[PDB]
Write a protein that binds this ligand. Structure first.
Ligand SMILES: [Mg+2]
Ligand SMILES: [Mg+2]
Ligand SMILES: [Mg+2]
Ligand SMILES: [Mg+2]
Ligand SMILES: [Mg+2]
Ligand SMILES: [Mg+2]
Ligand SMILES: [Mg+2]
Ligand SMILES: [Mg+2]
Ligand SMILES: [Mg+2]
Ligand SMILES: [Mg+2]
Ligand SMILES: [Mg+2]
Ligand SMILES: [Mg+2]
Ligand SMILES: [Mg+2]
Ligand SMILES: [Mg+2]
Ligand SMILES: [Mg+2]
Ligand SMILES: [Mg+2]
Ligand SMILES: [Zn+2]
Lengths: 127, 60, 116, 83, 99, 155
RNA sequence: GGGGACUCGUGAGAGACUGCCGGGGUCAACUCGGAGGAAGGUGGGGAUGACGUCAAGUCAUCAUGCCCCUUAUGUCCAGGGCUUCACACAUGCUACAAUGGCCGGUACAAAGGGCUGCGAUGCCGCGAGGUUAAGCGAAUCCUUAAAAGCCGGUCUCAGUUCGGAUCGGGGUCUGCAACUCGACCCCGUGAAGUCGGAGUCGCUAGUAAUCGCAGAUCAGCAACGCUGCGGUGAAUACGUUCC
C-alpha cells in the first residue's frame, strides 16, 4: 500500500504521498518555490528531512486546502514527520525530541460578547 | 404595546411599505425576529421553557 | 511652462502635472493625455512647445477651467440664495447643506471652537 | 420620483388643482399640504400655501425654482440664536 | 436505479437515526437494497439577545438551532414497496421527502 | 507575576544566515504582523552592509551590538519624600534585548529615505562606535555612574 | 464510468487519572523533574453567578395593587418632530504617509445567508446599475473575486501622486413618496491634520496589533455599531518596594 498520511495545523489539511525518489516538492501541481516564495517557510518544510538526513531522497506531493500560507506550511511539516515513521520505525526517538510529531493545538480564540475581540476590552472611563 | 396599535399592524395598511412586524405574544415593535415572530424577550422565556423546538442554549 | 494661466511646476510627471489646473483631476488627465498622444511618463521640463499647442486647444474645446468654472460655482451658490430655498438659507449661515449632523461636528462649515 | 425612467413626481391631487386653473387663467392661492411635490414648468406664476408643520407659507414660483421640491421653500424648524 | 431519494430532516439526534436505521429498515425485508444512511452537514442558526428587558447591553444569551439531515437513497424499485413507503409510522419531529 | 517566572519562548535559526541574532532583529522591526515585510528589511540592510565593508554582516552585526550593550541600568525607586534612581546590574539576555530595541528605535528617526538604508547606516555607525544608539550607551552609564551612592537600595 | 485508499461530513467509542519511574514531605495531602503520549498536571475556550448587598434598573416587553382621564390623557389621519446648534463630555472610524500611495500581474480562507428570494452566463453602460434568463428550497446552484501577502514598474520627503472633509454639477436603485432627513456611483473641488498638553485605557500567546468576509434587524439605509468568522502574527514578565 502507498503511504497516505495527513497533518493539520490551524485550518489547513495536507495529504502527503511520500514516494521514494530524488527530491521534488510538486505541491498541488506546483513546485516549492512557486507555492511558498518565502525562505522561512521553506526551512520548516524540509526540517524533518534534515534531522534524519534524507533531503536528497523521498520526493513528496500533497494536496493543500484551508488556512493560509503559513498554516499550510506548518501542516506540511507534520505530514512529513508522520510519513517517515511509516517507512522507517527507528527514527521515532529522533523526530520526537525536536517537536515534530506534535500537532501544536493552537486555534483562534473566539470573540466574547461585551469585548471588542477575544480579550481586548473597551475603554474604561470611571467618570 | 397599546391595544389600538396591535390591531393596526395586523390588518392591511395603505401603501404596502407602511407595514411592519410586531411580536405575536406581547406586541413589542422593536427587536422582533422573523424566524419566530417573537421579540428578544419572548424568545428568551419560550426557549427556556421548551415551548418552541430546535432551540436551546449554545456554547462553542 | 504656462498652459492656461496656471504655470505647471517643473520636474513633474505629466499625468500629475495637469492636475494643478482648476478643473482637471486625475481622471480627466488620463483623457487629456490620450487624445493628444502624449505619454503619461513624461517629465514636464522635456515638454515640447509643439506638444503644448495640442493641449491648449483640447482643453478650451472640451473642458472647463480657471475663471469660467470658478464663476459657474459661485453663481450656482448665488442662485440658491436669491430663490430662498433650504440650501440658500443654509449657505448664508455657514452650516452644512447636505443634511450633515450639526450637534457635535460640522467644524469645516463653521470655524474652530469658541468655548462659551 | 428621482429617477430618469419614471419622470418627476407631482401628486394627483395637485395637478388637477392647477390644470383646472391653467385653462381658465386665474391666479388663486393653493392651500396644499404636499411638501414633497415637484415644481414642474406649469407652476410658473402660481402661488402655493405650503404646510410647514404649524401654518401655511406663501411660496411664489417665479421662473428659476423649477427643478426643486415645493417644500424647500417652507422652513420647518425655527432658530434665531443661543443668545 | 436512483429513483427513490429520501431526505429526512429533524431537530435532534436519537430521533433521525432511529427513524432511518430501524424504521426505513422495513423495506430491505422485501428484497431491496439500500446504501445506508448518509449523514449530511448540519445547519446551525445563531441568535443572540439581551438578557435584561432594559439598559444592560453587555449581558447576552446565545441560542442555536441545529437541523440534522440524513439521506438513505434505496436503489431497487418494486411496485409493492411504493405503498410500503407510504404507511410508515414516522415520529412528529422528523420530516420526510420523496425525490 | 506573583507566581515566579514564565517560560520564555524559543527562536528558530534563520534560514539565510545561520544565527539566532538575525531572527531576533526581525521581531523588533516587525509591526502589524508584516513579518515577510520585516524580513525584507533585515535581509536587505545586511546585504547593503556588506557592500560597504566586505566583511560578513552577522560579524558586523555582533560588533554593532557589543558597543551598545549596557552593563548598568538605572531603575527607579521611591524611598522617602524624594524619589531617585538606583543602578542595578543588567543580566545578559536583557542586554541583547535592550540593545536591539535601540538600533531599530533610533533608525526610525534617522534622516534617509527607506528603512533598508536607515537600518544599514545605524549598524555601520555602531560597528565603528559613532552612531546615535552608541550615545545612549554612554548616557545610560553616565546616569549609572552618577548614582553609586544609592547602590545599597537594591529592592 | 467507477473506486473505499486519503481527506471531509457525523454517528457510536477509545484517550489523562499524578496511572507509571526517581528526589523532597508524618508512609500524609501534595510538590520539583523525567519516560511514554496528539495532549501532563484544571490540555485551551464556553455554558454555569452560593447566602446576600446597592429602597441599584425597568409601571415603556409583559403582569399588577392603589390613585387618575371618560365630548379626553381614549381614538383615526395628513404635515412636522425625535436629525436643531455659540458650546461640553464619552465611545469609534479615517488619518497625518516611503514598514507608504498609485498602476499592472498573481496566490491562500473559515463561518454563514437564499422562494415576498439567490441572479450564473451573454449583452448595454466610464461606473453605481439596466436587461435576458440557465440553475437551486440548497455538502448539488447562487452569494464567491477573500483582503493583507508575493513579483515588477512608478512617485522621492513635499501639506505631496499623503489626507478625503467640505462644496458644485450630472446619475442610479428601493419605495405611494428621498425638501426637511436615504445609501451608492461618476466628474470637478482638495479644508483641518506634519504623531497629539495635564492626565488616562486595553493586553501574558495564536494574545496584542493589523487585514478582510458573513449574519441578525432590514423595501432601502445613515452598520465606522453589535454578534460571529478565519488570514498574517509579536515584544516582554528580574520581582512585590510603591499605586
Ligand atoms: Mg482575529
Ligand atoms: Mg460604561
Ligand atoms: Mg419598515
Ligand atoms: Mg462548576
Ligand atoms: Mg430608586
Ligand atoms: Mg429611575
Ligand atoms: Mg398602566
Ligand atoms: Mg402620523
Ligand atoms: Mg435619538
Ligand atoms: Mg489619495
Ligand atoms: Mg494590486
Ligand atoms: Mg464593459
Ligand atoms: Mg496646517
Ligand atoms: Mg511628511
Ligand atoms: Mg490573565
Ligand atoms: Mg440590510
Ligand atoms: Zn414580545
Amino acid at each position: 500500500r502507498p503511504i497516505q498520511t495527513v497533518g493539520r495545523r490551524k485550518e489547513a489539511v495536507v495529504r502527503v504521498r511520500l514516494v521514494p525518489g530524488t527530491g521534488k516538492f510538486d505541491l498541488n501541481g506546483r513546485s516549492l518555490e512557486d507555492y511558498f516564495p518565502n525562505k522561512v517557510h521553506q526551512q520548516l518544510i524540509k526540517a524533518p528531512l534534515v534531522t534524519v538526513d534524507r533531503v536528497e531522497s523521498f520526493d513528496i506531493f500533497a494536496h493543500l486546502g484551508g488556512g493560509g500560507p503559513s498554516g499550510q506550511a506548518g501542516a506540511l511539516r507534520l505530514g512529513i514527520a508522520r510519513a517517515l515513521i511509516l517507512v522507517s520505525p527507528e527514527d521515532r526517538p529522533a523526530l520526537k525530541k525536536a517537536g515534530f510529531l506534535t500537532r501544536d493545538p493552537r486555534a483562534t480564540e473566539r470573540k466574547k460578547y461585551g469585548l471588542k475581540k477575544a480579550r481586548k476590552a473597551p475603554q474604561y472611563s470611571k467618570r | 404595546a397599546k391595544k389600538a396599535l396591535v390591531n393596526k399592524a395586523a390588518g392591511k395598511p395603505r401603501f404596502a411599505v407602511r407595514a411592519y412586524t410586531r411580536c405575536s405574544k406581547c406586541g413589542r415593535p422593536r427587536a422582533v425576529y422573523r424566524k419566530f415572530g417573537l421579540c428578544r424577550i419572548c424568545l428568551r422565556e419560550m426557549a427556556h421553557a421548551g415551548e418552541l423546538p430546535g432551540v436551546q442554549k449554545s456554547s462553542w | 511652462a504656462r498652459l492656461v494661466g496656471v504655470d505647471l511646476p517643473r520636474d513633474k510627471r505629466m499625468e500629475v502635472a495637469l492636475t494643478y489646473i482648476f478643473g482637471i483631476g486625475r481622471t480627466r488627465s488620463n483623457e487629456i493625455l490620450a487624445a493628444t498622444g502624449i505619454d503619461r511618463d513624461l517629465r514636464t521640463r522635456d515638454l515640447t512647445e509643439e506638444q503644448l499647442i495640442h493641449l491648449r486647444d483640447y482643453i478650451e474645446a472640451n473642458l472647463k477651467v480657471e475663471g469660467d468654472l470658478r464663476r459657474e460655482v459661485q453663481a450656482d451658490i448665488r442662485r440658491k440664495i436669491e430663490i430662498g430655498c433650504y440650501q440658500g438659507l443654509r449657505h448664508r449661515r455657514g452650516m452644512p447643506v447636505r443634511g450633515q449632523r450639526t450637534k457635535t461636528n460640522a467644524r469645516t462649515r463653521k470655524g474652530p471652537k469658541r468655548t462659551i | 420620483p428621482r429617477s430618469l425612467k419614471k419622470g418627476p413626481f407631482v401628486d394627483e391631487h395637485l395637478l388637477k388643482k392647477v390644470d383646472v386653473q391653467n385653462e381658465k387663467n386665474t391666479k388663486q392661492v393653493i392651500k396644499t399640504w404636499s411638501r414633497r411635490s415637484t415644481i414642474i414648468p406649469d407652476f410658473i406664476g402660481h402661488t402655493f400655501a405650503v404646510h410647514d408643520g404649524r401654518k401655511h407659507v406663501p411660496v411664489f414660483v417665479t421662473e428659476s425654482m423649477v427643478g426643486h421640491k415645493l417644500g424647500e421653500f417652507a422652513p420647518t424648524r425655527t432658530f434665531k440664536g443661543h443668545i | 436505479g436512483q429513483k427513490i431519494r429520501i431526505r429526512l430532516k429533524a431537530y435532534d439526534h436519537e430521533a433521525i437515526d432511529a427513524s432511518a436505521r430501524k424504521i426505513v429498515e422495513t423495506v430491505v425485508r422485501t428484497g431491496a437494497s439500500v446504501v445506508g444512511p448518509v449523514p449530511l452537514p448540519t445547519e446551525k442558526n445563531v441568535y443572540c439577545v439581551i438578557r435584561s428587558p432594559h439598559k444592560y447591553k453587555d449581558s447576552r444569551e446565545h441560542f442555536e438551532m441545529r437541523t440534522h439531515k440524513r439521506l438513505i437513497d434505496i436503489i431497487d424499485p418494486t411496485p409493492k414497496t411504493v405503498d410500503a413507503l407510504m404507511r410508515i409510522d414516522l415520529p412528529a419531529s422528523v420530516d420526510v421527502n420523496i425525490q | 507575576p506573583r507566581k515566579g517566572p514564565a517560560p520564555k519562548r524559543p527562536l528558530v535559526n534563520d534560514p539565510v544566515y545561520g544565527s539566532q541574532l538575525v531572527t531576533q532583529l526581525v521581531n523588533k522591526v516587525l509591526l502589524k504582523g508584516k513579518k515577510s515585510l520585516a524580513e525584507r528589511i533585515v535581509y536587505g540592510a545586511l546585504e547593503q552592509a556588506r557592500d560597504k565593508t566586505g566583511t560578513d554582516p552577522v560579524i558586523t552585526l555582533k560588533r554593532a551590538l557589543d558597543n551598545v550593550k549596557p552593563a548598568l541600568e538605572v531603575r527607579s525607586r521611591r524611598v522617602g519624600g524624594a524619589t531617585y534612581q538606583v543602578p542595578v546590574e543588567v543580566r545578559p539576555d536583557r542586554s541583547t534585548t535592550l540593545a536591539l530595541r535601540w538600533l531599530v528605535g533610533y533608525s526610525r528617526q534617522r534622516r534617509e529615505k527607506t528603512m533598508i538604508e536607515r537600518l544599514a547606516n545605524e549598524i555601520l555607525d555602531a560597528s565603528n562606535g559613532l552612531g546615535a544608539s552608541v550615545k545612549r550607551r554612554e548616557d545610560t552609564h553616565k546616569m549609572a555612574e552618577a548614582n553609586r551612592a544609592f547602590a545599597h537600595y537594591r529592592w
